[PDB]
Design a binder for these strands. Sequence first.
RNA 1: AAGUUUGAAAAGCACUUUGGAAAGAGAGUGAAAUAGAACCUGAAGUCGUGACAAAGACAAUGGAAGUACCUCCAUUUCAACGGCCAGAACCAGCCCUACUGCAUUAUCCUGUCGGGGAUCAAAAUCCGGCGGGCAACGAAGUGCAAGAAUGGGUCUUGGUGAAAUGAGCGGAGUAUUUGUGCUGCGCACGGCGGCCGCACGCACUGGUUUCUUCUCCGUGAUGCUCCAUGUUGGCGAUGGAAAUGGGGUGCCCCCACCCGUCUUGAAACACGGACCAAGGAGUCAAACAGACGCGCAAGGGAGGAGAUAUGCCAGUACUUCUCUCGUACUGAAAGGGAGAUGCAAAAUGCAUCUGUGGUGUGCACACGUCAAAUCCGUUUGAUUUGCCCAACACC
RNA 2: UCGAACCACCUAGUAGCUGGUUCACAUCGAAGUUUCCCUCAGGAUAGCUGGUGCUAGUAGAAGUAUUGUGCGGUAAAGCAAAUGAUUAGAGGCGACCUAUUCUCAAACUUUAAAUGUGCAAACAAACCGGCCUUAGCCAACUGCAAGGCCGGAAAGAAAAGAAUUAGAGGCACCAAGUGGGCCUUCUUCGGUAAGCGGAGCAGGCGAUGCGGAAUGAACCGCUUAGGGAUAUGUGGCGUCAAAACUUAUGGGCUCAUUCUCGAUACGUGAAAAGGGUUGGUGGAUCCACCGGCCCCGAAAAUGGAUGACGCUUAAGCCCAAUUAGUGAUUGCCCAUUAUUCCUUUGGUAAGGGCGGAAACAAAGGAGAAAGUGUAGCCCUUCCGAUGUAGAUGUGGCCUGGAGGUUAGGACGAAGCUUAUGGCGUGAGCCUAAGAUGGACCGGCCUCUAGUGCAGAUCUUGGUUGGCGUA
Lengths: 197, 49, 96, 68
Amino acid sequence: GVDLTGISKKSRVIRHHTYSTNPYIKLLIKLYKFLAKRTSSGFNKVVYQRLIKSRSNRAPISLSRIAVVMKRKAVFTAKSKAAPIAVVVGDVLDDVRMARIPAMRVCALRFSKSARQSIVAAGGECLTFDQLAMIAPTGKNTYLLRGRKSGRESVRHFGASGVPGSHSKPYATNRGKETKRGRRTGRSYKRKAFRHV
Amino acid sequence: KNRRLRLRLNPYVKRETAAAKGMRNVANRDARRKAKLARVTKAKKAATK
Amino acid sequence: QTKQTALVRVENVNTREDATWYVGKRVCYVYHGKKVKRCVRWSKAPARRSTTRALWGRVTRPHGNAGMMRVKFNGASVPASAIGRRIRVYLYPSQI
Amino acid sequence: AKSKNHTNHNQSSKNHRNGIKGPVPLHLHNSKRGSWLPALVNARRVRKHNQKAALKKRRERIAAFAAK
RNA sequence: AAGUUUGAAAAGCACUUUGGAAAGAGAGUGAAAUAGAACCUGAAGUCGUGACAAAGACAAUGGAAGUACCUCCAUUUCAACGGCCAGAACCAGCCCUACUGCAUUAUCCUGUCGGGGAUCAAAAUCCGGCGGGCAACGAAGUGCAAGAAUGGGUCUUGGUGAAAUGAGCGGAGUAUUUGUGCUGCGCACGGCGGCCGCACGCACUGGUUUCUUCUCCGUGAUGCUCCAUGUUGGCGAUGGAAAUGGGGUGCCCCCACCCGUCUUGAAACACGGACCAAGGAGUCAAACAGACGCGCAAGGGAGGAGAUAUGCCAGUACUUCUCUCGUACUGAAAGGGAGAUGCAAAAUGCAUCUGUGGUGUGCACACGUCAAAUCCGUUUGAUUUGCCCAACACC
RNA sequence: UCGAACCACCUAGUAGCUGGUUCACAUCGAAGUUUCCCUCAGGAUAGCUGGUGCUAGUAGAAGUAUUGUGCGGUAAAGCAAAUGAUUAGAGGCGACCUAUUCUCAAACUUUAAAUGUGCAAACAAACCGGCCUUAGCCAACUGCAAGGCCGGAAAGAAAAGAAUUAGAGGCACCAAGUGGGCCUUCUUCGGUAAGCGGAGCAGGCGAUGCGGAAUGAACCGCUUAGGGAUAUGUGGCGUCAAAACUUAUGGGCUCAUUCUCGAUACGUGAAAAGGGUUGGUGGAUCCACCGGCCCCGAAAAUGGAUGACGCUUAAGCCCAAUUAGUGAUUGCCCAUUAUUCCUUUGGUAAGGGCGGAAACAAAGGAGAAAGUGUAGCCCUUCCGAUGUAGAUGUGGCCUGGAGGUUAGGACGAAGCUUAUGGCGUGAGCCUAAGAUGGACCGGCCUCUAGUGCAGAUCUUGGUUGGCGUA
Ligand SMILES: [K+]
Ligand SMILES: [Mg+2]
Ligand SMILES: [Mg+2]
Ligand SMILES: [Mg+2]
Ligand SMILES: [Mg+2]
Ligand SMILES: [Mg+2]
Ligand SMILES: [Mg+2]
Ligand SMILES: [Mg+2]
Ligand SMILES: [Mg+2]
Ligand SMILES: [Mg+2]
Ligand SMILES: [Mg+2]
Ligand SMILES: [Mg+2]
Ligand SMILES: [Mg+2]
Ligand SMILES: [Mg+2]
Ligand SMILES: [Mg+2]
Ligand SMILES: [Mg+2]
Ligand SMILES: [Mg+2]
Ligand SMILES: [Mg+2]
Ligand SMILES: [Mg+2]
Ligand SMILES: [Mg+2]
Ligand SMILES: [Mg+2]
Ligand SMILES: [Mg+2]
Ligand SMILES: [Mg+2]
Ligand SMILES: [Mg+2]
Ligand SMILES: [Mg+2]
Ligand SMILES: [Mg+2]
Ligand SMILES: [Mg+2]
Ligand SMILES: [Mg+2]
Ligand SMILES: [Mg+2]
Ligand SMILES: [Mg+2]
Ligand SMILES: [Mg+2]
Ligand SMILES: [Mg+2]
Ligand SMILES: [Mg+2]
Ligand SMILES: [Mg+2]
Ligand SMILES: [Mg+2]
Ligand SMILES: [Mg+2]
Ligand SMILES: [Mg+2]
Ligand SMILES: [Mg+2]
Ligand SMILES: [Mg+2]
Ligand SMILES: [Mg+2]
Ligand SMILES: [Mg+2]
Ligand SMILES: [Mg+2]
Ligand SMILES: [Mg+2]
Ligand SMILES: [Mg+2]
Ligand SMILES: [Mg+2]
Ligand SMILES: [Mg+2]
């Protein structure tokens, strides 16, 4: 025997295959597994891992956010160079709060119809990953982006709302029911809003 | 124990074994013993005197 | 007990050095059955046909300090009905 | 019937199975709420001035870069 | 409780004979009587009969390894041929043997003088001085050890050259250079107070060759993977054959407390346990949440109902307003209601609209630099600077 | 049928309590403790465990040292020092004072360990000189405080014994079982004591076999995929029973007459007090003293227990060896352990190949899938493998029906029988035979459910030993 106490606690849970049933997703996974194995770019490896990931971990992104980050990168770029291609492993959605945008080249798994119309009208192009693999096989001159995950209702609900320093929402259908005792100083006590950690 | 592996790991082992055989020779042993005893006795006597 | 190794006591072998001389020698156990079955040279030498049968083995290593030897039999193991009965130890293969 | 009252026999082993985790480093969660108020107020005025200086500095870097 | 579920059709057993009868033995119908009347199939459990295996009293059952006898089973082989059984030889690897040098010895070894002891007189055990030292036979029960250039086992492993990488195979030389011995200069080391010693330490790869030892070159895959190759006898010449695996019964040596359960603790003098068949226990609906799959996305989606293909069709195809969840929250309530930058400081200030409110830590990408490796084309790591996506912390 | 009749219904009344709960492999794997509860045979809550992951893969690491710097009042010691007890003599003078003297304290202490415990040991940090801001301090500031900007240096931490790592850090979500424990080592409290009750630290059994102590949950050794070879651990080498076929060319001691000396680690027999042999201190010219082994002290209930026989030039007790003053280094036996070889299975797994190189008819052969999971796309390499309650996975097995697709059957479907073999780790699948049967039914991909039995004093039917017995 060999003393290997608590050795199973160093194992990590990682997904090695997709749970999706989409044949086009499977084709993309095949192509980018080949590219990641046979090239020396970190871009391909990151893209392959994100393609493997699940739907909840592939949050969508906003066209306005894309425009803002592209502008903040472009303000410090020489005028003799071309703007990078935005790349999102996920969905791109339109934004009504911003009406004027520059011409951008965007590659994504899926576009909403409004977002596609807005990009084309501004004067950009919508690309797919198979087109990207031919335009830039190693991912040179790209801009990898992710969508926002905090702000989801589930995240806002995570935790216990009755302990000091917590601001999570309780699971309740009647908004006016869980007030009074434990939430007001006049009713016995009030949950403390702040606590040093 | 394996001859080719030992030679592959250490190319000087041939010289080492040749020296070992030369030491284990009998006439060499007798001559060295006599000479060493004489040398050490002379050195000790000279150091004392 | 561990049945795939057998212990054999040989006459006039009473030291461990004596038992070393017999390492590698062939060993035979002779018994008889109930019916006449096939044997070596069944057709070449019909006079050998009999109910007599034999099991063969070899000596592997000494056992203890008193000249006992360990014996391995070809394939299967020797039957337990052979305990306390005669064992032949031949002089071949010869090292002399 | 009577039973066992109290013991601490196995508790140390349970606490070390997932280990006793160390403290959070000092540069994280260093909130100043509840500290001496007069010093807190004065520090707020300085931080407000620094933010305005940071915005001005970025504009100068942009203009210089455009001029090459 | 209980399917009259014989058979296509009653063709539902005429006739002989034994019996009081029930029935039996023949004969006959029918494709079947092993379909003979509540008759398709006809299991398990239990019982009778014939043949065989044996077996003391270890309750029986059970495990592991053999053997005797059997086998309505499977597969293989039957000729310069075996996928069967044995013996020996060689190759690679591994395992266990024999063969052994360097340091050390002094409380020691040996003579001689003295005293000391004992004897019948001696010697010897023992104690001082002085002079020499190697107890060296296989010296020593002592501190290390590197001796296979090259003895047997592997039915405890693979093979017979279908890549042999070898001090081992092949080729060419037959000389190199390891140690021992002797010895030069300078330094180092010990003693005395610079001189004297150096057991042979470091450098000069210092000299000498007296002994000791072999040395130098060589075969990529144009093979991605698996399988396919020696020698000598026995058995096998198509049989009621041989051989190798399965299967059955007995026997020997060894091993071995009765299952399920509650319990700290069961084999128990703790409970449930005669046998077999069929049956027998986490399901359906509604509200909520998390993980995962799918569609659309600042929007998503009904439901009820209608309309006509539609009059085969309880399905599919189509539809408007509306309704619902969400894009905004907060207060008991009357109520109110969230951009950035610049100038400025107005009890609703003014101006622009390509834009992360700020700071710290932070994928990828872009610009440089340094290492290591390289088939020289490039790779693998670090780091500088810029922007920093997701995210965390402080404002 | 009565300390409240009978019949039907509400009624499948409720049960924190008793009983039951149907296929196989694989990866992991506990708790009987905290707080609250009309709570003590139950719950909620945290802890222990599984699954799912997210994040820039060596990061903000450690049940361990070293160096530096803090904390402490147990063990011991003391009463000639404070508090509290306590014996006697002496001096000054019956009492008192003065120094002593004998013995002590869980709720007494001047002093004070060993084991402990907190912090630090250069990458969001620390160090050294510009500047900006503050409604902070001070009589003022170019002094102190705070937030920033610019620049420099950086054995990336020398030398003195001057760390090490089978050393990837951090962050979440969902949920099970458990909440009767027991034993041992050291420290202990109550009790005469207990296989008794109650605690502290650690290791175990529970949940676990295997090898030893004859036998034993907890003792000793060791911890577990399926098999060989070699070597050991604890324990042993007179027979039972493998090993000194009763080893040595080792030294001493011991005689035990009816529970019959001794060979009993834990532990499973023995006190005060006494006396045959063999040793040692002192004193004389033979006396006291105290050790080894043995003996007395030593009385029970079925016949019996160093495990049995037996053993006395031990096969007993205390030392000490390995073939014996001869030549220097391992006597022998036995594991689910160690080393090594073969095979399986799973990884936080690590690599290579996958543009068909060329050529090739019968009368050297085949294969070569860009791949979680298979009859695994193929090859090489390394590591792990036990487990109750419990969690999860499986191109994992089986049953009745539905949508598709592909077959079979009077030259014989389903069902039934088996010394019918073959395959698979297994659930199971397939073939053979029927000297059986007489009309339906198999494989594969999806869908669906009244879907798997050995036991519930389980339900219904049949059978059965007792038994040709009472
Ligand atoms: K003399
Ligand atoms: Mg939001
Ligand atoms: Mg309790
Ligand atoms: Mg019939
Ligand atoms: Mg019938
Ligand atoms: Mg029957
Ligand atoms: Mg003398
Ligand atoms: Mg050669
Ligand atoms: Mg049993
Ligand atoms: Mg009990
Ligand atoms: Mg039981
Ligand atoms: Mg009992
Ligand atoms: Mg009961
Ligand atoms: Mg709407
Ligand atoms: Mg309208
Ligand atoms: Mg909202
Ligand atoms: Mg309102
Ligand atoms: Mg109010
Ligand atoms: Mg009555
Ligand atoms: Mg019920
Ligand atoms: Mg009831
Ligand atoms: Mg209860
Ligand atoms: Mg139960
Ligand atoms: Mg485990
Ligand atoms: Mg209450
Ligand atoms: Mg109970
Ligand atoms: Mg004390
Ligand atoms: Mg003291
Ligand atoms: Mg006192
Ligand atoms: Mg140092
Ligand atoms: Mg309980
Ligand atoms: Mg008790
Ligand atoms: Mg239990
Ligand atoms: Mg154990
Ligand atoms: Mg005993
Ligand atoms: Mg024996
Ligand atoms: Mg005595
Ligand atoms: Mg006895
Ligand atoms: Mg006795
Ligand atoms: Mg015994
Ligand atoms: Mg393995
Ligand atoms: Mg397991
Ligand atoms: Mg059904
Ligand atoms: Mg049978
Ligand atoms: Mg059912
Ligand atoms: Mg049944």
